[model samples]
Target: FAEHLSAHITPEWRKQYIQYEAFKDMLYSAQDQAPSVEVTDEDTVKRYFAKFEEKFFQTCEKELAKINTFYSEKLAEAQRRFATLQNELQSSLDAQKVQHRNIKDLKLAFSEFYLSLILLQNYQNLNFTGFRKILKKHDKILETSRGADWRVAHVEVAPFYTCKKINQLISETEAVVTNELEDGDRQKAMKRLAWTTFRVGLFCGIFIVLNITLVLAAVFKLETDRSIWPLIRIYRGGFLLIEFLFLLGINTYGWRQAGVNHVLIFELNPRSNLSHQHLFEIAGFLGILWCLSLLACFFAPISVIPTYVYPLALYGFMVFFLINPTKTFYYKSRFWLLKLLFRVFTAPFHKVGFADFWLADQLNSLSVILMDLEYMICFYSLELKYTYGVRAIVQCIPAWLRFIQCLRRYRDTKRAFPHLVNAGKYSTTFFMVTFAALYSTHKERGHSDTMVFFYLWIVFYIISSCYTLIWDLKMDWGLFDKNAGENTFLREEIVYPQKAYYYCAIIEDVILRFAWTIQISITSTTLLPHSGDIIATVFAPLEVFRRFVWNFFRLENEHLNNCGEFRAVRDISVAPLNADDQTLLEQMMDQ
Candidate 1:
């Protein structure tokens, strides 16, 4: 029934649907009894039964109240729309001029109005059925006729059923459409007002065709398999980074859907935070532009266009929009991102929050994107000189920043154990970077030092992976609990209904945490040309994906913490105004 209601209930009116699952859970506890040895006192039995009955009736009454309120509001809204539409139709008829704008507006409005009517009817029926089922179940379990009698008195008299206005409104709407709008042809009227879905299949087909064409052009026609791989990685890196952003929004939706308080958890504007729809819309628009830019670079380069211009233009355009101060393009969210980035960058100076550190963690996943940005810019500016030097530095920037954030967090809290331990986790990456650089350099040359560096790199890599993995499972996700009970290795509480996702995620995390091992195989075998670059290029998106998966559980953990600790508001700290400063302020105000 939960599944049924989830599928059929109008999305906007989801909250109005009877909480059958919760109600059933309530019944579960009530029905679970310590085998009653027949009570002797009649008064005691009467009091106990009355108390239970009071609770049950109150629950039913509350649900009825909620349903009645929602129904009333919806009916009022439908009637208001109907009244306005009828007024407009009458005025237009009197004027003998039905404007095209009004006609289109009327069609759209009526279409929406018609759906509302149907949804209201469905809402009524579903709740009514739900009430009946719950009452029947209660009677069966409690061995009482109380629920059966209450259903007659309460459920039958509910406003959702008693109201006949909805039927009248719906019929009037259909008649208006048939006579006034569609020239009395009922078939055409219904057809004209029919709801439909857009051509996503064709959209996907075209997208796939474009993708294949671009790949073919890159591989065969342009002969970009050799030298331009790094440049291609940069563009592809940007594309996947945007994809990661879109997926983050998806995880946000998942969090919200599962009742995780992500808005409060992230300290975002409850009202203005971008919905998954808005995020996807933004991602789609940006994705289209990115593909178009790539297409232009590929197709027009035969006419002697400079290949660098497209990526540079795209990057600059994105940057411009990101920092665009005019009140367009979800400026609040854009500014929040920029402000958070600024804080993360300056983590050593400012106090860090969940949003700050969480974003820094995201940046850690985007290390390759940062490196791509560094390499591309360096390549264009200096014709690839010193690219590797700066690229190595850029690769460690996220970790270095994260390390400082942990340090700042330590300073703020003075809790060295966990904070310093976290700092140690990020610090390992600095060694990994050094070892990787040495390994690459010595491998490029002929030296036994290459073996030493490679060994050192793998050693640090394992240490880092294990350190991070343990933290992810134990500290971050709050899993691997001793008191897990039925949850086994997982925590006592989980927001997501499917336990399968948690187990699968743990396994997936383990595999991806060691994903860098793929680099070892590629480098050691030397089986593929430019294997290092190829592995790195492919691994960037994989790492982003791992972070994407990490996000759902990470926020889940944070939301759990919020619930456990009851910390919902932004925890702001104000500077103390000492005696002299306070006096100075008071004097200034007096003057």
Candidate 2:
């Protein structure tokens, strides 16, 4: 708390800095004014005390001016840096050749550029009105070059993106700088900020409605709608609800303007718009859903244990982890158990190791959601044989993707024996799921069905996922060096922080969502919602599962904002254009 408080409060606030308060107190000490201070003279002492009180106020005002001078110079230096970079960008724009053409040059320009911008409008300071104008001017210049033009494509940010999208992603960085400006003041002013008040009402309302439905669903041990076209019927209802909620999510955190005053059109840039907090809220949401689903096992078919007694206990544990009513959030302190462990013994591993482990854990939790769905289907199918844990023994779709992802994400040459060994292990699991998929489709396989095309898709998307993962791991096999920012194929240097992982992190999206696509291919019953069918949103446990995982990756990036090791690699990697900084360069260049 003290360190966090110091982050925003500035060094000017300490008592030692307020020399006047000390000076005023010193005058009465025995070393000075000794003869003037006698206890017997009540009226004299009272008169002197009155004068002393007046000087305290006067002295404080005098000291405040000095603090102002110090900060003014700091603020001025930042403004100068912003201007220098803006001109550097503008000069490039007016050049005969592509001005700051190299990806390496752009990276250096923006490393300093980002630092200055973050400093200018930090948590504790900034002239929001002035900064707001600069933000608008810069956005205007970037808007002109919103997509890759002429030579710009040759200097594109990452190989993972096309020329056009790289430009768009870079353009979005302007908004990031703008939103972070004057943050403390912006949030504090929110109470009277009428625009904020009206919207949070709905944001809070929709969240409450969704959560209430979630709680009731859990409490009653109920699933959803049993009728004709149950999958489509239930599926449509889920998407429609999500669309409603997604729009609200977009509204609250969506395509709003950058600064309190700058107006940019609605954009859905993942790096800028989709934040870590949103991801956590979703994880917390899943935690509750999974809790309810698992606890239901004991209540209904899998009641081997005392399911009735433990459901409530599991629900409470998950909610607190998600909602996080207080600190020790990720981990905690001096004598604090989790904090103690969090700080040392079991702090999250370094970003690379932690990233894969984190994904593994999310997949592990998500499997329960799948297990519940499969189990529920067997129960609803009403076969005593199926009920004896046939579905329970099977269902490797989630498991296959989960492990396959881990294989490629952290692959290194030294782990060669195990890397291929690991790949072979998952390969067996892959075939296991395929055969299990046959089990799932047996009674319902459509011969002329899109079944052929659907299963084909399974093989294609799953392999493509590994292909990209291997490509990334293969190329990125080096430590972060300040000079290694250039990448035609985007080598794995620490340049853009963990840019490779972001690419790797999202690899499973299409494969996981194939369940719905297969529904069109004549799936017997919709690939059973791993939970029961009802209330299952079209973007079920699988689609959102990809998102839920991405959220973890995003949150990790946010936490890196406070990490020096990440920033050192991050800034240098970023400073070089690592090829995609058209976004950062444009922020100050317009004017």
Candidate 3:
């Protein structure tokens, strides 16, 4: 009986008509049937199907209209609410504008009143001194008047040279003398001395160490037998390990000391100048650079020892040259002369075809852009392959290999000079051949056969990209002193505006997400192959897991501290700018 009713009533009516009206209404809404299910006939069934279709069409149109009306009403309600909110927002903004204007007017009035009082005090003091001067000189009042005339009369009545006026003038003179003594000559001379001494000491220490190490290594190589190569390697390895540990200790200590209250000691003291701060920054960069260089040395070809050693020697020489005061003076004096001579010698060649400056600038821009691009690509690749488990080893490996080759070529070309033969540049030209060999082999054997090799490549690429970006941003932000006035708001009213904060927040979030994605991808990829290997093989996964856990925790702590420091510095710089602007507005109003 229910099936018969449902068949007669439309599907749309079945869905909504019963809820909208009633069960009795739905029954009435059903098509008028002349016969019941007791009479089973093909013609009756056909007639019932035709009746159901007719009712279904009618119900669908009516129900659709009701649904449209329901949605339209809800939309109109939402629009009304939005309109009300917009009106409230405008009223609030207008109120704030009125308040801000009133505050500005009050501030200006106060400044004007204060300036007038200051002028009155100066006038009164001058009059009292003038009265005494009159008694000493002419012993008479030349004129007496009010306001501007009174000031003029007092000036005329004062003696040509009285003890009171002389002493009063000398009081102003003493201020100038005090400022000169405290801020001008002595402070500058002391700062210069401190900077010179610090540079000399730092340069001498670095140079002596590098030279001594190189000499010892050379001596060992010349005297030692072939069997002693392993010992030499061990010695170099041990030295590196020791150096790394010492550097780590120093970095931690320096970071701790950075928080101490040395502002007054450094700022007020004439002997502690900006150069002291510069030295600390330079030292930090050098420490990081040294560690990176050491790592590079361990990996770079042995044949490139001379190339690496030259940079070390050149850096040392430059440091030494900067330190020696006499040498510095000599260089300063002759620098212009040498510059002129070089220009004269190169003028003919420069006019011909070479565009050295333009080339160098292009190279610099390319290097910076490529470095950033490489990190982005690696980040994307790792996220795609590991996080999404969208395996594409065949595509990733070739692309990355090509990128690596291009990067190496760019680096080598950047380092090349006209004087050098540029062997590194030549080596890059052969990279394509090596790439071809790898490609051919992979094609013959298939991608699965080269899984281990490609997996390792992916791991290195991810790690290198993360490491490079983190360190580069760290150094750049450190150098710029991002907490400095560069990023501060122009007005106190805009203190930490949502737009600025959100912009920075978004950038930081993107960087962190990208870094995390790359890291997780690399970790997953590395662990996947070793999942079974670790279970059955020598070393437990616990060892690797422990290292990872420790590394991530330390990274989090360091990043948090860095972010906090940046915020503190930013606020400090912003505060002074705000104060200065307020002071300037007050001064302007007084004028």
Candidate 4:
């Protein structure tokens, strides 16, 4: 029935529908009228009352045309509206499964329809977690969406990923999430922090396992005409399989966790529980690890320490990064450098505003991205090669790191998530991999080069692509900040793909996905050519591989959002982007 009615709601109808509504509203004004007939005579009053009733019904009949217009022209509009609602509904229902943006339409639509009116309609036995919150809201400004969705974050939620955008719809009246979850649970924080560390362990652990297993087999086969390279030649695809899982299961998930950390926490009540003490403690721990790794680097020549120093340094850096416990970023430290930097940026601000939260968020993500990208860019090596059974593994180290981070982050967070400062626990997370760039190569032709790399490459490029896009999005988000201005609608060409999107899609998708002719499963170098490159596992059964291949095609419009207005429930006022915070954020923006 809706499908049939939906067809009538066309662009043409939308153009005239406003007028029909105007006239309908004008006519329905009679519904609110109370007849005032003098009751001097019973018969006379009855006659007058009857006349008034007839006139009112006659006037109300005109509204039937309004109803017909609503059903006809409003059908398509209603569907779009419904989609927006459903999107919002699902975000709340699947609050934990939260995802991302359209902003302009939401504000205009909300005001036109009004939030209270939205809740008033036939709300029979509604039961979503956020039902009362939406129903009771007198304010909470309408925020825009990029593609995923656009809605208001309640006093508590608008700050963190805007409450996990609910999922299950019990009925038109009921939803899963009634309101946003607070971010103060300590055990969950410990769980999340612990989960993140486990991944850090996993990345380092498996990397060693694969390298050792392969090298051991190689040593075994090396006793005579018994060359061990044959094993590598035959099992080249094995590492690709490992890398596929790292990509899909590990790194991709890490990105999602970053989202949880960023969006969900910021919208939560307290932001985070772990305070300044936690932040420094993490750095201190990293310093300890960093020193130990340096010692290993120093002793690699005498001790059998694989000469791979950077991986340890990477672990220390990443562990500090993942478990960082700063939420409000309230700089209380007395370091001259910190104070100087803080003063230079913040002292001159005339005002602060809601943009600080976003600015703070970008700074958080920016640091993580930079640290992760550092691993990709270093290309560090101890220069060991063929004679010692050493060669570069995972030619595209950037992609490998992305894969590990994505999957591990995903798994690491789902068991539980962090939104605010945990006792203060939550902050930012971006941890990744170890690519054996020190491994060797054999460029011989027609050598049956073994290879099984697939799907993972696409993910690598996507992560790589966001390096720039995040910058653009973050900056653009600031401009859209509440403090930026008012009544000015800004629309950037946000959905189109950048050049890198094409490079990977074509090079990896077109060439790599189809090359079923290679013999050396691991050494094949069509897209990436590290002959003896040391890399690990990533699962890619055909079905999952196809899904990953298509993932890049899926468009998610990410953004900062606000509902049109708020209420007395809790903290309705948008905080001014604070002076020190804004200044610090500006500094980050420049960086």
Best by lDDT: 1
Q: Pick the candidate with the highest TM-score.
A: 1
RMSD of model 4, in Å? Answer: 23.7
Model 4 TM-score is 0.22
Residue-level lDDT for 283 in candidate 4: 35
lDDT of 1 by residue, 95-181 (tens): 764477777787887886786677667667767877888898889977899898998888888778889999988899999888888
What are the per-residue Cα lDDT tens digits for candidate 2 across 153-230?
321222211223323323333543334222435443232125444444545555556656656755785654333233
Stretches of candidate 2 exceeding 4 Å from the true structure: 1-198, 204-228, 231-412, 416-432, 437-591
TM-score for predicted model 2 compared with the true structure: 0.27
lDDT of 1: 0.71
Superposed by TM-score, candidate 3 places the C-alpha of residue 138 at a distance from the truth, in angstroms, of: 43
Ranking by TM-score: 1, 2, 4, 3
Q: Compute each candidate's TM-score over C-alphas.
A: 0.61, 0.27, 0.19, 0.22
Candidate 3: stretches off by over 4 Å? 1-213, 216-221, 225-591
lDDT of 3 by residue, 1-591 (tens): 242233223232332211222322433444354355577786886676556545533553354344334334433443453444345434545677565565444334333333333332333333334333322322132122222333245333433212253334334323432342234454442332276556646754764575566566556545432343232222332233223333333433443343321222112222222333344444434544444344444434467464235334434644564455564344542453354334333433332111222122122211212322333346436733122222223213322333343344345445333212222322222332233334334634577655555554455445444543343234312222343355452211111224454245335533543443333333223323334222311121222222222222222222333221111111211111122222322332222
Score each candidate by Cα lDDT: 0.71, 0.38, 0.35, 0.31
Q: Which segments of model 1 are wrong by more than 4 Å? A: 1-209, 216-226, 301-305, 384-389, 442-451, 516-529, 562-591
